[PDB]
Design an enzyme around this catalytic site. Structure first.
Site, PDB file in Angstrom:
ATOM      1  N   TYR A  93      15.791  31.344   1.665  1.00  0.00           N
ATOM      2  CA  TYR A  93      14.709  32.178   2.170  1.00  0.00           C
ATOM      3  C   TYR A  93      14.932  32.555   3.623  1.00  0.00           C
ATOM      4  O   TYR A  93      15.422  31.754   4.423  1.00  0.00           O
ATOM      5  CB  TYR A  93      13.359  31.471   2.044  1.00  0.00           C
ATOM      6  CG  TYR A  93      12.856  31.379   0.637  1.00  0.00           C
ATOM      7  CD1 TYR A  93      12.649  32.516  -0.133  1.00  0.00           C
ATOM      8  CD2 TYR A  93      12.595  30.141   0.065  1.00  0.00           C
ATOM      9  CE1 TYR A  93      12.198  32.409  -1.449  1.00  0.00           C
ATOM     10  CE2 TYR A  93      12.150  30.021  -1.230  1.00  0.00           C
ATOM     11  CZ  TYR A  93      11.946  31.144  -1.986  1.00  0.00           C
ATOM     12  OH  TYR A  93      11.485  30.970  -3.276  1.00  0.00           O
ATOM     13  N   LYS A 101       0.836  -1.185   0.000  1.00  0.00           N
ATOM     14  CA  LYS A 101       0.000   0.000   0.000  1.00  0.00           C
ATOM     15  C   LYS A 101       0.880   1.248   0.000  1.00  0.00           C
ATOM     16  O   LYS A 101       2.088   1.191   0.283  1.00  0.00           O
ATOM     17  CB  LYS A 101      -0.902  -0.011   1.222  1.00  0.00           C
ATOM     18  CG  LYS A 101      -0.155   0.283   2.517  1.00  0.00           C
ATOM     19  CD  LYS A 101      -0.970  -0.135   3.715  1.00  0.00           C
ATOM     20  CE  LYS A 101      -0.311   0.313   4.997  1.00  0.00           C
ATOM     21  NZ  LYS A 101      -0.678  -0.587   6.113  1.00  0.00           N
TER      22      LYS A 101
END
Ligand code: CL
Ligand code: CL
EC number: 5.1.1.1
Lengths: 386, 386
Positions: free
Chosen positions: B272, B39
């Protein structure tokens, strides 16, 4: 309505996107163009439909993180300029030329080798290049005017490259102290001026991100790069509180309750680690979203979702594919009820800014880590499509 | 070697997946089959190639999170049984019967509704069903012996369904305190034996995850669900400390340096927020991985990568598509150098488990949130492909 086997999905409101563009278009100079930034699967919103829509409604160019993201937009039928903002390997020059993807470049050697690859193959387009000038981001680009001139001369000499832009990135235009932004800008402007008194005509100058376009529209020059604002999210609370541009969030994350049960019999333990014991008549709903979808495991026993206009707490640990929420003692809920994970429901709202605050991150990360196994539905003019 | 425009990628060692399967095979009773859990895109490793290899080397059945994940496996040719662990909407009963996907169910209304859907369609495929018994996970599944009996009866009275399994999930089998694990087992056994005392013959009984297959191999019953251990990762330090089974990690996450520069000119800000300022002779290398790839923004100024066998620190803030690392004053790196983000290099190693502790999470979330825009390359018998 929406028919899924696993009932979790994203709604991207393209009407919000259109409105976010017009707001920006009306704030910045009328001469300036808008580059819509749809890297990272459109900041998690889907790159194809957001690009298609932004080009319809104010944007003339697109920016992506890589050639492959660019090719995905070409394969969708898009003929607008596509600029790759990161580094592209020389081994992809032939492929970028073939798909007419504009490459960022900032080195003399890269230019020459790119030009030879393309001339050795003749039957080619010319590869469009934007030069990245690093004025303080420290990431990519040229840092001196002497190096920049070396690069512009190598590019101008290269018959199979074409010079269509030069840009820089502001690292702090979202902060109230503007000193670094103003310094970046005059560094850039002095570099462009150095090139002008060499008799070098300049192509499209672009420098503003969302924050700089709102806060310093006079920096718009030829083109701005609209990223986060395009999705209706502000770069920072400071830019938001300037109250200059009204942006409308585009993304909602929803699910339907998979199962509801009263916790009558023992054990009343909930999820991995049994970190949450419910009350004998507490009602636990199970939701089909998990951390493998991008719903952070850090929201274990902390997160909220909207169920019937009320916030209901996440109960127990987040699992890979599912979360439990407590509806309370004798809480009301049915299998199939619509739950809002990010977005609005009735009165209430769980914005991505809030989840990002609660996780000590920024809205950028909350939306662009939304897994691609979550189907994206687009609303345009009130109506859903895919 | 490997040629990418954007030079980041994942390597999944299938020889290690083979070894982890053998290690588990020798440790559990010969009667018991192995169901490989793939999964969430194979826990971020790629569902298809891991499933193909698992079925080649000891796994008999597969487990996924949703019908959509099972359909991907079927489209790749896999014919083994595939169990959906999660809740599947009734609107996907017919599709699940067409693709021969096995669903879990635990409600009488769902059984009856699922049956009549296939009835109303004169369906030739009988829909395989596993019943989920909730013995303390509190997530999905039937909780009392009376309700379970009613569910078995509704299943057995449904000509278009086929009962092929019954199972439960252990809430805490990865912890030193085995109190709840013993309790759940005791409940689960009493329910099956309650059923057997009613003249009901049981299909495949399964209950173990990696943790309980390792720690309680006598709980193996007919089949175990091998998830995290398949990928070579232990469910907890506790299960690793028990030194019962030797697992080999199958995933590494690598990239190539995009740019190297010495920070001679001002400003020397990196990334940043200008949260990192370099020294005039510091070497900053830019890497093409960012938070949208699954490399948490929380690693800003705290994470490391491996260059030339050394840990080098992430410099400044992680950005969407790129990180900056410091090679130190007069550090040695070239554009194109291979860096290991997760995994082994020369002598050193950054394990997924270390990254998970650093982020206050578990290795499951580190690997299963590796974004799909990162190409997966598969190594089988010391040789790569995709
Ligand atoms: Cl940059
Ligand atoms: Cl469960």
């Amino acid at each position: 309505m929406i028919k899924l086997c696993r009932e979790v999905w994203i709604e991207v409101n393209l009407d919000a996107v259109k409105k976010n563009l017009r707001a920006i278009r009306r704030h910045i100079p009328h001469k300036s163009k808008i580059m819509a930034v749809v890297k990272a699967n459109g900041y998690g919103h889907g790159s194809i439909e957001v690009a298609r829509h932004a080009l319809e409604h104010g944007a003339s160019e697109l920016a992506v993180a890589s050639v492959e993201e660019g090719i995905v937009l070409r394969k969708a039928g898009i003929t607008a300029p596509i600029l790759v903002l990161g580094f592209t390997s020389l081994s992809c020059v032939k492929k970028s030329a073939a798909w007419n993807i504009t490459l960022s470049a900032f080195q003399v050697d890269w230019m020459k080798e790119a030009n030879e690859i393309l001339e050795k193959e003749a039957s080619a387009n010319r590869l469009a290049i934007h030069i990245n000038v690093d004025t303080g981001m420290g990431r990519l680009g040229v840092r001196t005017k002497e190096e920049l001139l070396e690069v512009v001369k190598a590019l101008k000499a290269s018959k199979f490259l074409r010079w269509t832009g030069i840009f820089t990135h502001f690292s702090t235009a979202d902060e109230p102290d503007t000193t670094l932004t103003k310094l970046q800008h005059e560094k850039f402007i002095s570099f462009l001026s150095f090139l002008k008194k060499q008799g070098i005509e300049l192509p499209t100058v672009h420098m503003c991100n969302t924050a700089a376009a709102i806060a310093f529209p006079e920096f718009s020059a030829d083109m701005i790069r609209l990223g986060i604002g395009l999705y209706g999210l502000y770069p920072s609370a400071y830019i938001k509180q300037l109250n200059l541009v009204k942006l409308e969030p585009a993304l909602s994350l929803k699910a339907r309750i998979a199962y509801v049960k009263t916790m009558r019999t023992e054990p009343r333990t909930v999820s991995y680690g049994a970190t949450y014991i419910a009350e004998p008549n507490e009602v636990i709903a199970t939701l089909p979203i998990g951390y493998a979808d991008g719903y952070s495991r850090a929201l274990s026993n902390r997160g909220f979702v909207l169920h019937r206009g009320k916030r209901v707490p996440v109960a127990g640990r987040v699992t890979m594919d599912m979360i439990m929420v407590s509806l309370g003692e004798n809480g009301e809920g049915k299998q199939g009820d619509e739950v809002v994970i990010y977005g609005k429901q009735k009165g209430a709202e769980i914005s991505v800014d809030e989840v990002a605050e609660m996780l000590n991150t920024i809205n950028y990360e909350v939306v662009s880590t939304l897994s691609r196994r979550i189907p994206r539905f687009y609303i345009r003019d009130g109506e859903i499509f895919k």
